[PDB]
Amino acid sequence: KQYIISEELISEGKWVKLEKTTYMDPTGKTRTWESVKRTTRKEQTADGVAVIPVLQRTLHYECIVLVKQFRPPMGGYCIEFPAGLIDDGETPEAAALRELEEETGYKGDIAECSPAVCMDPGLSNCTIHIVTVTINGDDAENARPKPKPGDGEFVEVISLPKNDLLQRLDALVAEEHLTVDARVYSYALALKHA
């Protein structure tokens, strides 16, 4: 039934553009939408990755490793899964492993990799791979891990037990002004609901 008729550029910055999208509705009528896209997407299967890093150590409960950063669009701090854009020619897995080490200092092992999933599909075309990665916290590589953050990146690491994630995220939200990412919250909720 439905499909894109035309995409007209309305405004283009260095990083994001806004487009007027003309599409065919399933009645047969022509309609429009205001679409956001990134300018950085090349031949990657998605814009970015988000990493679900499960930190595993003998005689410890498993922890989910999360990051806290200032986010300019939000005007504040947010708690999220480690994440970044996929470099040109980089695989989603390499990008996940790389971003996890840069944001946390951990060296992980790939567990699984999702298909490309949409971030906010009524607003933008942005997509990611969700890459699950186990971290062997008994390995010396991962003992006293140093974040190697890039140009103007300033990330704090927060490891929360998987068995109590939702309450621990609620505790954090109770204690400061800070926003939990929707993917992180959805994951915490399903841990509870299981």
Ligand X SMILES: Cn1cc(Oc2ncncc2Cl)cn1
Sequence ranges of the binding site: 15, 33-34, 38, 71, 83, 85, 99, 103, 120, 153
Instruction: Please tell me whether residue 28 binds ligand X under the rule CB under 6 A.
Output: no
Select from 26-34, 64-72, 149-157, 186-194 the region that touches Cl ion (CB under 5 A).
186-194
Neighbours of 67 (CB within 10 A): 25
How is residue 82 written in tokens? Answer: 């480690």
* Dist CA 45 CA 157 (whole Å): 28
Among 85, 128, 165, 184, binds ligand X (CB under 6 A): 85
Residues paired with residue 38 on neighbouring β-strands, in sequence order: 16
Angle at the Cα of 185 from the Cα atoms of 116 and 90, rounded to 5 degrees: 30
The neighbour count for residue 104, using CB atoms within 10 Å, is: 28
In a 10 Å sphere around its CB, with 0-12 CB exposed, 13-18 middle and 19+ buried, how is residue 108 labelled?
buried
56 binds, among Mg ion, ligand X, its own copies, none (CB under 5 to 8 A by kind): none
Q: What is the DSSP string of 27-41?
A: TS-EEEEEEEEES--
Contacts with ligand X, 127-166, as mask; x by CB under 6 A: ----------------------------------------
Closer CB to ligand X, residue 112 or residue 120? 120
| x/- track of binding to Cl ion for residues 50-69 (CB under 5 A) | ----x---------------
Rg (CA), the chain: 19
Q: Which is nearer to ligand X, 111 or 123 (CB)?
A: 123
> Whole-number minimum distance, CB 188 to ligand X, in Å?
25
CA distances from 20 to 25, 37, 39, 41 (A): 15, 11, 15, 18
Q: Closest distance between its own copies and the C-beta of residue 60, in Å?
A: 15
Q: Which residues are annotated as a binding site for Mg(2+)?
A: 83, 99, 103, 153
Q: Which two tokens stand for residue 103?
A: 């944001």
Whose Cβ is closer to Mg ion: residue 58's or residue 75's?
A: 75
Give 91 or 134: the residue with its C-beta nearer to its own copies.
134
